[PDB]
Write a protein that binds this ligand. Structure first.
Ligand code: SF4
Length: 71
């Protein structure tokens, strides 16, 4: 399975992730991105149909703010 998170410390509010994959990411309110449904650890589990999309925006994030991993 795949999970993902956003590091708000480095996010530059470029809007790519939550424009491209609104299923996974959203504007938290001030331009910075956050996953839509995070756990207490902040991680969001990704639906299998959205894995490749998530993996793509992870590579495309200009600030390397999106952390994604296989679990
Ligand atoms: S793609 Fe990266 S820099 Fe752009 S809004 Fe999402 S987390 Fe922030």
């Amino acid at each position: 399975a795949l999970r993902t998170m956003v590091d708000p410390d480095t996010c530059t509010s470029c809007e790519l992730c939550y424009d491209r994959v609104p299923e996974v990411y959203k504007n938290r309110g001030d331009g910075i991105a956050e996953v839509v449904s995070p756990g207490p650890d902040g991680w969001m589990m990704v639906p299998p149909e959205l894995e490749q999309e998530v993996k793509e925006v992870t590579d495309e994030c200009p600030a390397g703010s999106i952390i994604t991993e296989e679990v």
